[PDB]
A paper describes a structure:
Podophages that infect gram-negative bacteria, such as Pectobacterium pathogen ΦM1, encode tail assemblies too short to extend across the complex gram-negative cell wall. To overcome this, podophages encode a large protein complex (ejectosome) packaged inside the viral capsid and correspondingly ejected during infection to form a transient channel that spans the periplasmic space. Here, we report a near-complete atomic model of the bacteriophage ΦM1.
Using cryo-EM, we investigated the whole particle structure of bacteriophage ΦM1, identifying two decorations with relatively uncommon morphology, and a tail fiber/spike assembly with features similar to the recently published structure of Shigella phage HRP29 and phage T7. An adaptor assembly (gp52) interfaces with the portal and six tail fibers (trimeric gp47), each of which appears composed of long helical bundles much like phage T7, as well as adapts trimers of spike protein (gp39) which may be homologous to those in phage P22, another podophage, and 9NA, a siphovirus. Gp39 was poorly ordered in our reconstructions and was not modeled. However, AlphaFold2 multimer predicts a structure similar to phage HRP29 gp52. The short tail assembly has the closest similarity to bacteriophage HRP29 (16). The core consists of tetrameric and octameric ejection proteins which form a ∼1.5-MDa ejectosome that must transition through the ∼30 Å aperture created by the short tail nozzle assembly that acts as the conduit for the passage of DNA during infection.
Residue numbers in the entry:
A (entry chain A), G (entry chain B): 2 to 49
B (entry chain A): 583 to 776
C (entry chain L): 1 to 58, 65 to 154
D (entry chain R): 1 to 9, 14 to 35, 37 to 42, 44 to 56, 65 to 149
E (entry chain X): 2 to 154
F (entry chain F): 729 to 776
């Protein structure tokens, strides 16, 4: 058995077949942030 | 707090009046959410027991002291990675139909319990809650938030690599920050390449 | 009430609908009318849908619930992730045990003199063994025989 | 005693503890409980009446007070309250407060039953009833 | 779980415990059919933590038996967090084990000591009723039969 | 239709003296993601 | 066991997660100098 690691998660959504997606693209994102420095975390709440 | 269109309100004798701008949403399936607003326990979830249909008065769960609190609505934070790939020296892709995925490794900077679902072309494989906070961590105390400054989680898959879909949900007061992802891949070539 | 259910079998009972709540399906048992030997699963009754029981060898039927008493269900190991259901189940087990015991379902005997401050016992049953209690009927009807 | 107390002949001093004033009930002379407003509360530890008197305590059994799955607060007071309720339930059913019957035969291990009442309907008889043969 | 009995053939002098407990104060001895426990320090001793040694009438006559009983604290929980108790895994495991023990003791009839409401036996029978000694006792069989047969003539 | 699968075809002939075609004129699609082959070549002297 | 060396200390403070910081950045600096040629030493005093 072998191991590995996904390069990054900072290129947002994509809809191409997995053979051609660039490095960092993901399949689904919703109510998240693509923030650098802090990572791929949740968005804050909306204030009234 | 982790809620939408939240307002501040005072609670006395485990009762208060629902603000006007949330009556319509809660009446159409939206989920009411309450949180602490001050002191060391700030940000922690609290629940309710009933809502009077005529006066819109709300009664909270037992043993909440008088003070300031927030009130709002919930939302989800779905995410879904892309399946791994095998790539040789020159960058070509190989083994799309001859590889099997065994596991995921997740490193989290801060998080609580979340929900994970893994499914295949025709059946479900994994399901249930996961967390990175253990019973022997000093981070777990009463009257403190339930979050871990650093941890890891492991999830089994046992299925073909590319015929899979993975999702992670979280709709509670705790964050979900993903720093890195790792996997274990079982692939075995049986002839040289040229 | 909570842990015991009864069902009269007047010429028609072939299925029974469960009204009690149980921790797991393993805790259910059946007795036919007064026999101390329980019915055999797989030959006289079979589960249908987690809320219905099918009968295979057909007066009243009785249903009993008996939760485990050997351990607490969850043991909090030092490497187990924290959750809420793991506490809810443990707190539920004790309430189930208390409900079972308050109805007298699980009592078996005594090792001390039983005290009653003037109440009575109604459905004592007919003594067979020499070391048994005597009902009013048994003694009253015995006087007539020895008064011919 | 922890769940019940008895007074033998105006005012009754309660020594037991309770969660709410609704869990307390009264009975008289091995009777239906006395309807309050026959008796009424006078302070948190005295009862005013409007032979012997008995008091019984019965906490709630349907549900646990706090459920952590339904959003119950995660602090020390809820754990303490849950443990106190659990201990109170043991104190209650340990003394046979709510027992009213059995569904399985009982073995006394050779001991004796005392203070039994006379039978009216076919049941268990006392020694005095059998002693009155006089033929 | 909570009760142990030993029947002596004429040489019983030592007993090996086969039941667990929280503290040594919970154990007591009652001989066979007496309503008074044996006095500690004059009738039996603690030997280590596994054996009990008799001191008075150590050779038990034939047919007599010794019984051992257990009773855990019921007044309060061992650990109260609001009273300064630390929060660990042990403080929860011990709390739950305390409640388990009280159920184990009750299911064997070692704890109940009274009744306040008439019972309904639903047709079941009592077996070992003993023998009457006072006018308020429940007369058992083989006592009515002897009395009735003793006056046939 | 099948969401994912594979097929194998034998040739057994000289590599470059071949012609291959794939036809489809029915209600089902034909999407080709990748193609792989097995080649039998054996050098018998070093190169330089 | 293995050994290693930090490349340099001449890029001042940063606040990104360690995965993404550039070479030479540090976490905290105060009353220091980022001086080349002489290294990362303390600042001189202020004269009246």
């Amino acid at each position: 058995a072998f191991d590995g690691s996904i390069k990054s998660l900072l290129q947002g959504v994509s809809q191409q077949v997995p053979r051609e997606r660039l490095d960092g693209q993901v399949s689904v994102q919703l109510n998240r942030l693509s923030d650098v420095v802090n990572g791929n975390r949740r968005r804050p709440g909306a204030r009234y | 707090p982790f809620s939408d269109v939240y307002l501040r309100v005072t609670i006395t004798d485990r009762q208060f009046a629902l603000p006007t701008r949330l009556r319509a949403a809660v009446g159409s399936g939206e989920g009411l959410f309450i949180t602490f607003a001050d002191t060391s326990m700030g940000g922690m979830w609290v629940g309710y027991e009933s809502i009077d249909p005529t006066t819109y008065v709300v009664t909270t769960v037992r043993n909440v002291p008088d003070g300031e609190y927030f009130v709002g609505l919930r939302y989800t934070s779905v995410l879904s990675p892309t399946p791994p790939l095998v790539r040789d020296a020159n960058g070509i892709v190989i083994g799309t139909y001859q590889s099997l995925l065994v596991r995921y490794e997740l490193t989290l900077k801060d998080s609580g319990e979340f929900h994970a679902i893994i499914t295949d072309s025709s059946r479900t494989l994994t399901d249930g809650n996961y967390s990175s906070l253990v019973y022997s961590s000093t981070e777990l105390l009463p009257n403190n938030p339930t979050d871990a400054s650093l941890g890891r989680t492991i999830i089994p898959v046992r299925a073909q690599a590319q015929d899979t879909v993975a999702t992670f949900e979280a709709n509670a007061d705790t964050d979900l920050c993903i720093l890195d992802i790792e996997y274990v891949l079982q692939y075995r070539a049986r002839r040289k390449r040229i | 009430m909570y842990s015991v259910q009864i069902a009269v079998s007047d010429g028609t009972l072939t299925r029974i609908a469960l009204s009690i709540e149980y921790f797991e399906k393993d805790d259910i048992t059946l007795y036919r009318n007064l026999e101390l030997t329980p019915l055999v699963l797989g030959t006289d009754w079979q589960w249908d849908g987690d809320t219905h029981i099918n009968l295979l060898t057909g007066s009243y039927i009785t249903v009993r619930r008996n939760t485990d008493i050997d351990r607490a269900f969850n043991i909090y190991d030092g490497g187990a992730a924290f959750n809420r259901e793991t506490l809810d189940e443990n707190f539920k087990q004790m309430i189930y045990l208390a409900q079972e015991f308050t109805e007298g379902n699980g009592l078996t005997g005594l090792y001390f003199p039983l005290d009653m401050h003037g109440f009575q016992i109604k459905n004592l049953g007919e003594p067979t063994d020499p070391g048994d209690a005597v009902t009013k009927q048994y003694v009253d009807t015995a006087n007539t025989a020895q008064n011919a």
